[PDB]
Amino acid sequence: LEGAGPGRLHGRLGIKPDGQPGYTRAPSPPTDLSMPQALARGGGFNLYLSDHLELDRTAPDARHASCRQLHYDLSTLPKASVIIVFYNEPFSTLMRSVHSVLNGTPPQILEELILVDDGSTLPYIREDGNQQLVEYLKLLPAKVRLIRNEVRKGIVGARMKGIRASRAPIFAILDSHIEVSPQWLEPLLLRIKEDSRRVVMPQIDGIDAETFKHIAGCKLGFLWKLMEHSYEGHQTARLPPEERQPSPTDFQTSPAMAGGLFAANKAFFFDVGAYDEDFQFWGTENLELSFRLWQCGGVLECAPCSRVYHIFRKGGSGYSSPGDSITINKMRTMLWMDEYADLAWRVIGKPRVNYRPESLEKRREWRKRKGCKSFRWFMENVFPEGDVVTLDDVPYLGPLRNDKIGMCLDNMGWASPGHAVGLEYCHGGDTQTFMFFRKVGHVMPVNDDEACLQPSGRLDWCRGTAQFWWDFTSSGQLMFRETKQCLSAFGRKLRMVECDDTDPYQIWSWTAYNPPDTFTFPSV
Amino acid sequence: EGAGPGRLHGRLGIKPDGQPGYTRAPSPPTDLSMPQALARGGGFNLYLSDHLELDRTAPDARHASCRQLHYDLSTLPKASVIIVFYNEPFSTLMRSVHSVLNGTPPQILEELILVDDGSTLPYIREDGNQQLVEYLKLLPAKVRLIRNEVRKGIVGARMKGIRASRAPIFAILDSHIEVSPQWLEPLLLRIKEDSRRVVMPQIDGIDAETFKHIAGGCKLGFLWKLMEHSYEGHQTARLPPEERQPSPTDFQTSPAMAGGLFAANKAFFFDVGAYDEDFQFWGTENLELSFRLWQCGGVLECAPCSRVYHIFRKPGDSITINKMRTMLWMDEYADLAWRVIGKPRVNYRPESLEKRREWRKRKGCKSFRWFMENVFPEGDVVTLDDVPYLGPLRNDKIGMCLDNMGWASPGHAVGLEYCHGGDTQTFMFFRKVGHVMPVNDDEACLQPSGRLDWCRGTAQFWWDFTSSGQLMFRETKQCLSAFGRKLRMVECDDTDPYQIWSWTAYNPPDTFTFPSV
Ligand SMILES: O=c1ccn([C@@H]2O[C@H](COP(=O)(O)OP(=O)(O)O)[C@@H](O)[C@H]2O)c(=O)[nH]1
Ligand SMILES: O=c1ccn([C@@H]2O[C@H](COP(=O)(O)OP(=O)(O)O)[C@@H](O)[C@H]2O)c(=O)[nH]1
Ligand SMILES: [Mn+2]
Ligand SMILES: [Mn+2]
Ligand SMILES: [Mn+2]
Ligand SMILES: [Mn+2]
User: Fold this and answer.
1) Binding positions for Mn(2+) 2 (chain B) (predicted)?
2) Which residues contact A257 (CB under 8 A, 6 or more apart)?
């Protein structure tokens, strides 16, 4: 288009022949607006507001002041195809994303913008509907090209379609509800140019769901629930001294990624394994990629100078996925965890589903023909700062039983942090199973490695502090280091008392965790 | 203690002197009024129960083929029978305990837990005549009484028993029941082979007035009023051919449960969520468990060889709440269930309900769509596309809507009234059976006579809503007309404005958003 300049590097977007925008902008949201139910009608974010906000919405520059003091030679960088996959995404969010990309990315480095309709059922995105999307696209450069799936395949399914259709040496995947900051793609391209084996991910800022205000705020690990988790304080303390507070312009390696939003050399991406194409809908596809990448000769970095705003959803869901899809994706990811899969399996509930075993083994066959390294290696070199680097760091996993009263601890059915622990009759169920992390002395319910027992008799969010460090003595006591008192089950009440090996009420029996050397997947 | 067949636990309830510790009452009076006696007894004739023996033999209701089975008692897991009760009469409560001990081998019965849910009767009291507490001393040690300081409800009372149970398996029973031979043996074997199975005995009946033993429908669905309903005729026909006439000895799956008489592995039960302990007093806890059980990796089966007789009898806010909480497990279908029970707006404890929404997602429980397509695919509404119309049936010519006239119960006539946009003027359509029904009662069906009647899945209730807007009845090929504020059938003709109706389309959201408080 024409009108090129700073702020609209691809020209004035969204103008018809007449010269007036082809987007009917909405008036200010109502005064009599109920916010808690609007975040459901909008599918996670306030849509009355997004519809009233302009598609060419300026956004503050969130990169560090030192990041702006850089220079990139556009003529010497490879072009890249940005891929935006979307399903039933509202018009305002989807176009504001495309606008933000086209407005803030030089055309010299943007080969194309591929939009992937993953079987949307909205009338504006359907080819048997009002045709608002397709019609409006003619008002965008040819770079922007829409492609569809006749049926919803999921993130993995839709993302491969975009990458497979991409034409550039590099692709950059983005969400359909995003806004970028200046020079967001330039750092990624330069980094992948010098080593095609690097998968680089931008730092993700936020667009508030309710207010749409721009909110600011690199190393990311994982939880044994098979969820991404940001490096905590005690984990950043285990870092090498010179990497504990890296500079704002440095590329920092990350054990894991936050799911989507990354750039990668297309050829390499297909040679390090693309995406397990049996992963369904939403799920843990971000870890299988993270684990697989590192073990098979790749690098995962984050560029603090490449920042992108993202609408994290709140009090609502944008789409509906089946209940089994999440467990399947986790089971398949456990293939890359080797012996540690035994623990991951118990945290997610020792589940047994149809994880498509036939195709999962062919990935194991692929894994061995590629010579990919082990997860123990991964844990010892890529994520050595984790609380569980070896399965010896989980010495006890099982019921915490007091023989005197003949009972064991019980989460009372809610393993989520915040509620109180009670004494009940032992039935050997997951509700009465507890594991121990010796690196931080955390006593946690098996089904949630974020909940930690405290002297108060209740669970709370696990922090690697003196407020959660427990000691399991040789006598069998649960001693709390800070106060140096031991936990007693006297009268079916949880109390702290002077430690004393003669008090049978404070002697506990905790099963030892001596799992196998190799995890054998379940049956179907 | 004198043990043998018929009294597998020995002679129960005898004092040291050698005389029963229960004074039987004489035959009920001849000048007895049944309606007044069935009131003092609380549902069942208590004058008779008091005169009936606690060691009352009962006919074996099991199929003759069920008796040709063999169980090795030494290889079966012990089970804790839990009987919860509130203000249950002595005779009925004890005849049950006697029947259990009399018809259950001691090797497989770890204990029998009696749960007093805050009874206020003098015989059940720590400050009363102490009839129950004393008489229990004359029963084996297996029998253990425990109480709740205040009436907590079924959910509250049953959990107290399950938590107090010490056996790998528990069996929940009513306080007014009598068992058949080998009632517990089939259940234990089934749960031993797969701890994920929740097995239910088939329920026979004890008449309330005469106390006759009555023979007893193993497949159970549900209504959009959130009530269990036994598979109707047209529903059993949608079953696969190999399950339309199941054998008397085969275990048959049931989408839902009809009251809380079931056995389950204790560990499994607590991992499948157990019972929403925010459910209050009596209510629909049987469906919330059923939906949750199936979606979270469990099975609900019925054992036709395990039979139990049950004496069927003859606050209000708790019930609406329990239904709201159950709708959490229905996903988008809650929109339909919500309008059928009257768009209620109450304090459903929206806080603790979210902990279930997280609990459900942390467990990876499947969707209600899955449930309806795999567990209850024989239902009349498998998808919300099976309910295409929901709204007033309006005739623009006379400017009126249909009206249930304030009753909605089957049997009453439909009249024509002026549209006010209320629930009494709302009607939904089930396309699998062509039922025109009032929204507040999916058991009432429009008929050509101009009246509602019990919905039966027959050609006698199948309506067709044409593209022109007519209500055509398939059997007679006649259309409904509102000529003269009267409902009558006329030869169909799209040019007649009196037989053209406007019915709102039902295109609900993709996810149900609960109301506020
Ligand atoms: O079956 C699906 C599910 C999601 N998405 C899209 O994938 C992108 C990433 O998912 P999402 O943003 O919902 O994940 P989040 O980052 O919010 O956790 C979004 O544009 C979704 O609309 C898709 O195309 N198909
Ligand atoms: O607040 C209550 C109400 C009832 N029950 C007992 O729970 C059992 C099942 O209740 P209900 O009488 O409704 O059984 P149904 O008659 O529906 O089979 C009976 O033994 C009741 O006495 C109880 O423990 N607490
Ligand atoms: Mn997103
Ligand atoms: Mn943390
Ligand atoms: Mn009953
Ligand atoms: Mn019926």
Assistant:
1) 229, 232
2) A199, A201, A220, A228, A286, A289, A290, A300
